[PDB]
Amino acid sequence: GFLTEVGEARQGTQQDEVIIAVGPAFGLAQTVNIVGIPHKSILREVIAGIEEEGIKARVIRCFKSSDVAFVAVEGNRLSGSGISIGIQSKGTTVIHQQGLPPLSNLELFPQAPLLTLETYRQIGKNAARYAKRESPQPVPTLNDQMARPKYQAKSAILHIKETKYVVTGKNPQELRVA
Amino acid sequence: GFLTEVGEARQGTQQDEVIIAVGPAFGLAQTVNIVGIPHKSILREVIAGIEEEGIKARVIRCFKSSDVAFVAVEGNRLSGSGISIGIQSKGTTVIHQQGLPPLSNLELFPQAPLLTLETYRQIGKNAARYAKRESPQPVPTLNDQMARPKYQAKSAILHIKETKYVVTGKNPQELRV
Amino acid sequence: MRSKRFEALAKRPVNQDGFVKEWIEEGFIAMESPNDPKPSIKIVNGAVTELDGKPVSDFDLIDHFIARYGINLNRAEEVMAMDSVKLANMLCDPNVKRSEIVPLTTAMTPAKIVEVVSHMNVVEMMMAMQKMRARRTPSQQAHVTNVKDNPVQIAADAAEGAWRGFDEQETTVAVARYAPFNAIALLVGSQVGRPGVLTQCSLEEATELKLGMLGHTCYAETISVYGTEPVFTDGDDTPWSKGFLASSYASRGLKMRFTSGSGSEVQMGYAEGKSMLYLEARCIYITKAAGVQGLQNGSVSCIGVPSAVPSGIRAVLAENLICSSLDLECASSNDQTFTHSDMRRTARLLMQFLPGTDFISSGYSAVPNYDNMFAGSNEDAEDFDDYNVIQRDLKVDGGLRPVREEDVIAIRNKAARALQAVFAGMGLPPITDEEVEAATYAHGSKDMPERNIVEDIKFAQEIINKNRNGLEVVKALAQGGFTDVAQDMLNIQKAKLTGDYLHTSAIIVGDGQVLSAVNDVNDYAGPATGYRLQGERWEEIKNIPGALDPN
Amino acid sequence: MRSKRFEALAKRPVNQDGFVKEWIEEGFIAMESPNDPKPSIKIVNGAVTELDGKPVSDFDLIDHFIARYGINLNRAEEVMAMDSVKLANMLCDPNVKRSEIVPLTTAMTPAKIVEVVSHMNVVEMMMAMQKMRARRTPSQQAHVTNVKDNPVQIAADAAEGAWRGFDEQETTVAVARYAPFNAIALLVGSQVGRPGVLTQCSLEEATELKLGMLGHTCYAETISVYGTEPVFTDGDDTPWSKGFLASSYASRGLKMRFTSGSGSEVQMGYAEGKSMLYLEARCIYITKAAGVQGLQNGSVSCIGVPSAVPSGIRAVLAENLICSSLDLECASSNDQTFTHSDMRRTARLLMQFLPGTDFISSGYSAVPNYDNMFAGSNEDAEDFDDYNVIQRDLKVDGGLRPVREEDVIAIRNKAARALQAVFAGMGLPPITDEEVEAATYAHGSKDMPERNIVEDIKFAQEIINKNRNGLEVVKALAQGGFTDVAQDMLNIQKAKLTGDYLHTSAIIVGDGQVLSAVNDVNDYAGPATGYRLQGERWEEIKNIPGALDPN
Amino acid sequence: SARVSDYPLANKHPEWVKTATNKTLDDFTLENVLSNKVTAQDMRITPETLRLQASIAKDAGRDRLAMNFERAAELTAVPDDRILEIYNALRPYRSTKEELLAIADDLESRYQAKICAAFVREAATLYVERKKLKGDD
Amino acid sequence: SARVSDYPLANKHPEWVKTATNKTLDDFTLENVLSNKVTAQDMRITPETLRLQASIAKDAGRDRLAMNFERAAELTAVPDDRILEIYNALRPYRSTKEELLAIADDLESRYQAKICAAFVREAATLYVERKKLKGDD
Ligand SMILES: [K+]
Ligand SMILES: [K+]
Secondary structure, X not given: OOEEEEEEOOOOOOOOEXXXXXXXXXXXXXXXOOOOOEHHHHHHHHHHHHHHOOOEEEEEEOOOXXXXXXXXXXXXXXXXXXXXXXXXXXXXXXXXXXXXXOOOOOEEEOOHHHOOHHHHHHHHHHHHHHHHOOXXXXXOOOOOOOHHHHHHHHHHHHHHHHHOOOOOOOOOEEEEEO | OOOEOOOEOOOOOOOOOOEEEEOOOEOOOEOEOOXXXXXXXXXHHHHHHHHHOOOOOEEXXXXXXXXXXXXXXXXXXXXXXXXXXXXXXXXXXXXXXXXXXXXXXXXXXXXXXXXXXXXXXXXXXXXXXXXXXXXXXXXXXXXXXXXHHHHHHHHHHHHHHHHHHOXXXXXXXXXXX | OOOHHHHHHHOOXXXXXXXXXXXXXXXXXXXXXXXXXXXXXXXXXXXXXXEOOEEHHHOOHHHHHHHHHOOOOOOHHHXXXXXXXXXXXXXXXXXXXXXXXXXXXXXXXXXXXXXXXXOOOHHHHHHHHHHHOOEOOOOOEEEOOOOOOOHHHHHHHHHHHHHHOOOEEEEXXXXXXXXXXXXXXXXXXXXXXXXXXXXXXXXXXXXHHHHHHXXXXXXXXXXXXXXXXXXXHHOOOOHHHHHHHHHHHHHOOOEEEEEOOOOHHHHOOOOOOOOHHHHXXXXXXXXXXXOOOEEEOOOHHHOOOHHHOOOHHHHHHXXXXXXXXOOOEEEOOOOOOOOOOHHHHHHHHHHHHOOOOOEOOEEEEOOOHHHOOOOOOOOOHHHHHHHHHHHHHHOOOOOOOOOOHHHHHXXXXXXXXXXXXXXXXXXOOOOOHHHHHHHHHOOOHHHOOOOOHHHHHHHHXXXXXXXXXXXXXXXXXXXXXXXXXXXXXXXXXXXXXXXXXHOOOOEEEOOOEXXXXXXXXXXXXXXXXXXOOOHHHHHHHHOOOOEEOOO | OOOHHHHHHHOOHHHHOOEEOOEHHHOEOOXXXXXXXXXXXXXXXXXXXEEOOEEHHHOOHHHHHHHHHHOOHHHHHHHHOOOHHHHHXXXXXXXOOHHHHHHHHOOOOHHHHHHHHOOOOHHHHHHHHHHHOOEOOOOOEEXXXXXXXXXXXXXXXXXXXXXXXXXXXXXXXXXXXXXXXXXXXXXXXXXXXXXOOEEEEOXXXXXXXXXXXXXXXXXXXXXXXXXXXXXXXXXXXXXXXXHHHHHHHHHOOOEEEEEOOOOHHHHOOOXXXXXXXXXXXXXXXXXXXXXXXXXXXXXXXXOHHHHHOOOXXXXXXXXXXXHHHOOXXXXXXXXXXXXXXXXXXXXXXXHHHOOOOOEOOEEEEOOOHHHOOOOOOOXXXXXXXXXXXXXXXXXXXXXXXXXXXXXXXXXXXXXXXXXXXXHHHOOOOOOOHHHHHHHHHOOOHHHOOOXXXXXXXXXXXXXXXXXXXXXXXXXXXXXXXXXXXXXXXXXXXXXHHHOHHHOOOOEEEOOOEEEOOOOOEOOOOOOOOOOOOOHHHXXXXXXXXXXXXXX | OOOHHHOOHHHHOHHHOEOOOOOEHHHOOHHHHHOOOOOHHHOOOOHHHHHHHHHHHHHOOOHHHHHHHHHHHHHOOOOXXXXXXXXXXXXXXXXXXXXHHHHHHHHHXXXXXXXXXXXXXXHHHHHHHHOOOOOOO | OOOHHHOOHHHHOHHHOOOOOOOOHHHOOHHHHHOOOOOXXXXXXXXXXXXXXXXXXXXXXXXXXXXXXXXXXXXXXXXXXXXXXXXXXXXXXXXXXXXXXXXXXXXXXXXXXXXXXXXXXXXXXXXXXXXXXXXXX
16 A cells, blocks of 8 residues: 555646656556566656656556556646656556657557566656656667567456556546655 | 399308398499498498307398388398398398298388498397397387488488389399408 | 476477466457347438447447448348358358359448358368458568668668568567658668568558658558447547548558457457457458558457467457458458467468468568567568478468578668668768678678667658658669669659559559559459469479479 | 578578479379379270270279279269369369269269369368368377387376377387287277277288287278389288288278378389379279278378478378268378478368368377387377367367376376286286386386386287287286276277277267267258367367466 | 549559649659659649549449548648648547537638548537547546 | 168167177176186177178268178188288289189188189289289299
8 A cells, every 4th residue: 555645636837857657556456567566666666767867756646548658648748847657557668748649659668578677767767867858868678579478468457457447537646655 | 332243142041141132222323321321331330240149141132122121031031040131222221030021020220311330230230149049139219200301202212213223023143242 | 296298298388378268248258259249230211220239329439430331231131131151151152252242241230240250160261261352362561670770671671571572561660760761771672672562661640641741651551440439549549530541641642551450459458348359340340431441450469369268360360351351451460479389370370371361461570570579470580481381382372482592682782782872862871881781691680780879860850850752762762873773662652643552452563563452353263263373483482492303 | 601591591490301393203293293194984884994094904903903993983974074173163162062072072083083182272172171071070099109119108198198089099119029018008098098999009911910800909090002003012912902901800890991191102112103192092092992991191101202392281181182082081190290390290280180080180199209109290299288279279179188187197097007907917027116107207208117128029929929819908907906997998899899880980989989970970061060169079178278267 | 434444544544644733654754853853742643543543443342442532532632731630630539529620611611622521520520429529538 | 781870780779789609799798708708709790790881881872881891791701810811812922823713712612702702813813914923023
């Protein structure tokens, strides 16, 4: 229970933060990603890479879609810096930006099983750089032709389960982290 | 060019030999087995194995069929021991003996690409060993599931060629090596 | 004590694949689900009041699109009343002409034609597919990608693939902003390999359309549709936006197809309790209704979803058969990894390979799978020889051929050199002779010098922001010593003016000769009829490396 | 400078296989050779005077046998006059019943039916095979051997085999003197695994029948015939000696089939300039003429001959189809290695697995290929998981099933024990308790304590020398406390007394229930008819190891 | 009215194919490209060509394909950036009902793209019903 | 004459079956085996059983198979080693014509195997012509 909903998030007013937007079942019905990394550790590394760069990390839970693009979009809307990080419970991550089409992004991590706690901290790091307007070099690509054979059905199932917590029309809740 | 014709062979009459009957191209239109072990080397190694057991070694070339079992059968009738060795140009080899049905044998080496001169020597000896009516342990099996995939087409071609030298009703000429 | 037998088995690669028990309430069932709707249609005053159980009052956007534009209402009542078993028999009967069947199938509802093909086993489906395939001649499509977005390597890999037989080639980007370079490299190398090969660069929808408008692609394929309303919505489209997009590509004279595939609605969280096959049929009817000529399907990137459940690979063949039966071009997947086992992936591919489809694969990887930016294909460049041998073993035209190393080296080299001149001529970050050489002899990006990515992407982006169009590539080639190649490039731009290759299954062969289902009519009537591997093409297929003269 | 793409390809396993360019003159061509004789037949007063271009004056023994006994002369002229293309169409047409076709195909000359099926592609052949297969239910046959001719292992394996689903199992020997031991191990173990499983031990002709006269086997298969007269003679037989033998087996109440297969004549030096398929057709007619119920073909042991040349694997499926079209049981090979590549051998096997034959494989190795005394099979024990997954993927009944470790370990234990009891109960080289346990968890002979093979080779020749019959085995069983197996082994001998399993395709299932073409009639008429995988068997095929519940 | 017999237009009737700027197929040569005697803006398929292809599709038994080509013929008149604006306006939650009808009215009055205008009005109606307008997510 | 509807005999008409010492299928139990109330001469298929299967084969459209079983039925009278002798005599180069006609005659008069006897005579004639008699190699 390291996540407390503290109220409907409001838009940021300065380019001094990055929003981390998580799925409606993040740290709740699901508590690890597809390869067992705890959600607790994931948020901690993302938050550290951000803070690492002299930028604030703000966390919200999104409800209107469990799609990671749209989760991120919900975050970039509110991000005072316009930059957001969307994360599904299964671990899939995206760095998004106020202004881009929902299915466009700054950086995408479309193979969750290959992500480590290190990747996660690098991702926050770069989101902060984007927020600062530096043009960071992309977090290096992770690819593996067997990730789908090994994990795509499990991915499908973890997404079906998180998707049951979607609430149409419900605004994002800012999150208190333990 | 190691085997000289030398008159049509005949019966032994004594259990103190071992006949080596080769197909109608062995050392002739074909000079090595399927993997390149020259005809000279292989013969020499089986002859070696025969005598080391104390057996006399004869050598004849057969002409009536290119089939290794019948080639060996042709000499099992000429061998005073009743035991013989049939060896095709491509290399396949069998340990035969009078009284056995022709497609039966004492020991068969059905995968020629797996025969080494080690193996060829060891055969002469089991051939000598049976001949004294000794009960040799059978030469340890060599089985490679990829032997056919690599060499069967080649085997077919080498046999198609050795077969052009088959001569109906012709008798096994003796052989001076 | 553990069985040594079961311990060996446990080690087999197939046991690393994901398998799941069927989950019917969530649509995690490939076909024949008890939740699928019984086929039905009611029509009043020329408008559908009920479709496959559902009253018009509950229609979602997909139901509406399909009921209004997807079905021949004039004969729907007649065909609904026909026996689905008889109809499936007609599909595989060699003596029932494709032209007698399409008037019926295009009058079926989605649930009806699913009920029909569900009566079939895969042998019957294959017997049917060789007949229902729209183009008489089967073809093939390849992926040309690499981990580095190296343009040199893309042009060389593209010319090799064109030389080996691919009539369509598809690239995409590891780094989004590289897109214009990949597209131009793919197009140039393809033209060097065989003039007429069509190229696409799969991107974000708006981005890809803009790129086509600039002249750097020949067609678009990954124009997605989805089989439930919530999933379509998360896919950021509706049938009307995608139907408008289709017409937008045609208004610029560009060929396009939609993409779909069993298992996508499961993967994206809303199957609405329906089987994959049934939801895929809705996608096939959204394609038909939009007036799109063709479709990439057969699970495509979600292949891990049907493959995990019973009869999923049968289901994959079934959705391709439904696509062809509904008189759409079928680019039949076989482009995405779902297994660690060679035996298993081979069974999956033969379903389309043996009968032949418009594109047997919609993305054979023409690079080693480490360089495949669609996360791996079902076949890759290291399978080229096996594919050729199987063609030769079965006397099946798989659309590819054996090729000589010296020919491939020269073609790759010429493609690298042509692109060198393009880059020099257009003021892009140079391509060095060293780079030309590596691309020549490369297997993949592991063999290529690292490029200055910042410089590339800045010039790639200026192509887009300054609208540097396709004729700039033509000119650079002409002025840079590559007149032949420039002519071929201009010729493929000219195809965009006539609308000829917009038709069902169009490819471009020989000397700029369009070949589609309109002029290359499938006329299967059983043994010794229809397309047959024979003559010179058979000779070409038979000449594998390793086959020495018995004499 | 080498291309690294080609260096990568040159390393692929498929490039280790043997391939050759066709050699027409020496019959090194799988089918469709211009040397093959044009179909013809001339009949005078009910006897053949001309057969396929040859006058009776020039007939060889094979011609005589086929002309006098192998063709239905009542419709021979009528069928000869029919168009071959039209007859090929009838073959794959779902709506032309098998029963309508059999009276015509059995009236065709060998060249006529070769001409007919040569009009077909593999998809049509498969569509045809599923209809023409004599038994409604497809089945499977396994190899049970080891390089040491270890009897204790053989029983263990035999038992696993039967439990997995094989309905026939075959043993053989590296050392011919070993023969009686293997036979009895396979027999006992097979009945332990499943009572009704039929067993054979493949040896020299005269030796095998003796074995069968003794009661140590339940059927024979490797009763060879050949397609040219010189080759048949080096095979040490004629059509009449093999026909005599066939009836000899029947007179002792033993089921048997002949064995043939494309490429044997080439391998044995005299193809008489004809294609492999035409010569195999002659072999299939020899079988039919002899009144033998069934045939093992699809190249079988000479598979590296048709596989080395174009359209060879298609020729293999075609020889199977002729077999079934001639109303013979078809045990369709898929039992011998021809390639280093898993992709390739999977394509070769699907040709029979997809439609189904009487025996999809006529010797799946139920041991790892190192232990396979037929010099390796196209499938081995390490493929069991793959084979089950593909059945589930395609909804195809491949005749086997997913099984439990527990169960297997149990099964193999009860068999080595049996044989153990058996083995001492006849006063043979006892089976050591260390031998019994090893074999319970072995995967292969590599896991087995070496044995005394000249002790055993003495006793083994003894059984046959001192004509020790199968009652001696029945006695040591029950008298070892093995009620069932002695019993079950009696019910086998009972089936021998009734003659019911002598018929086309007979196997024995459930409670000694014979399943043959006579009582398990293939009634295929297109979709939703004929054998359909469903019910419990489908449940059984779906329940594979590793499937996770979604929950 | 074009039939299957008239396909391919580039082989059977190349002169039927002209561009917006009235250039001919044969006008597109390396030399005219190099002299800029033709440019990108000359290389555009015409509504004429698309309606001929529509006619051939109909003749080939493909009525909805033809209808796609008829929409395309209208859209040749719409500038690239407007095409992209209208495509985007049709995606979920982008637009209000009124904005869609304004696009439809504009398509019709400015471009005479009456089939596309009906298409957009259709969407607006159903988007209301299925809640895919701005503010419905 | 037995018919397809008569098959399998074991299920439909087990009383039609019996043995080389005549009993019934019921009787082949392990008890009798131990007690030797049942032995190997009680467990040989009979000619009668094989003629029934021949008629069924005929009914099932398989005339050659029937012919097979009718020869089988005759060969039940020939002793095991004599079967082997005769099989071996019919192999290439094993016999003289004279020798084969003796077997035939023997088959007919000693065992009434009229079909097999005709079978052997046939072989003898053809062996002369295609030269597979002893000494023909
Ligand atoms: K594709
Ligand atoms: K077998």
